[PDB]
Design an enzyme around this catalytic site. Structure first.
Site: not given
Ligand code: 017
Lengths: 99, 99
Positions: A25-27
């Site tokens: 997860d690059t995000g």
């Molecule tokens: C707030 C953002 C910068 C997104 N982040 C990473 C991202 O990859 C997440 C990681 C992620 C993956 C699956 C479920 C929840 C979170 N995905 C996400 O929120 O995407 C949503 C919008 O597009 C959809 O695609 C799937 C989820 C939806 S995050 O999960 O909240 C995050 C923040 C900080 C850390 N240390 C670890 C993770």
């Protein structure tokens, strides 16, 4: 390995003798896993993302073998929908984005 | 370009005449931007992240020009903390993870 993004970039990881799948997860700045036992001292923290914030346990200097590559860094434990390998560990295996 | 992950993978985007920075996010299935107006009809949907969910407006066939590469696809608009380019558009510029 080269990984396209047509499907979720889920790899198999070995962490604390346990086999798990995780997102590359690059995000994500940091790595976070579902509830599990990990060694060493931890501290409660609170991370956030899309929709809100969760409470997790921050473990330091944890070893993970990510698709056959070894990395040591901080791993957070808590109610995440998915295990995600974040940039804190992606860098250690020298992972890049290319286009 | 090759992008390392020591810093956040932000890139400059041009979308509907507007310039924005957005996170190349391999953990995002879909692309979502903060509040803005876009062409076409939209349908309300719900997306879920680490710690909760958010109401967003869904737009289809939106043109995005990411770091000089063009792509058309779904773009969601809602109260996201950071603009993220998800796999639905990363795939269109031929983005890959490499380690
Ligand atoms: C707030 C953002 C910068 C997104 N982040 C990473 C991202 O990859 C997440 C990681 C992620 C993956 C699956 C479920 C929840 C979170 N995905 C996400 O929120 O995407 C949503 C919008 O597009 C959809 O695609 C799937 C989820 C939806 S995050 O999960 O909240 C995050 C923040 C900080 C850390 N240390 C670890 C993770």
């Amino acid at each position: 390995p080269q990984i396209t993004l047509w499907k979720r970039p889920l790899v198999t990881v070995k962490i604390e003798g346990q086999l798990k799948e995780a997102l590359l997860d690059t995000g994500a700045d940091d790595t976070i896993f579902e509830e599990m036992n990990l060694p060493g001292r931890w501290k409660p923290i609170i991370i956030g993302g899309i929709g809100g914030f969760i409470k997790v346990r921050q473990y330091d200097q944890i070893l993970i073998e990510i698709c056959g590559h070894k990395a040591i860094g901080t791993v957070l434990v808590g109610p995440t929908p998915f295990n995600v390998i974040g940039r804190n560990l992606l860098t250690q295996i020298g992972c890049t984005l290319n286009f």
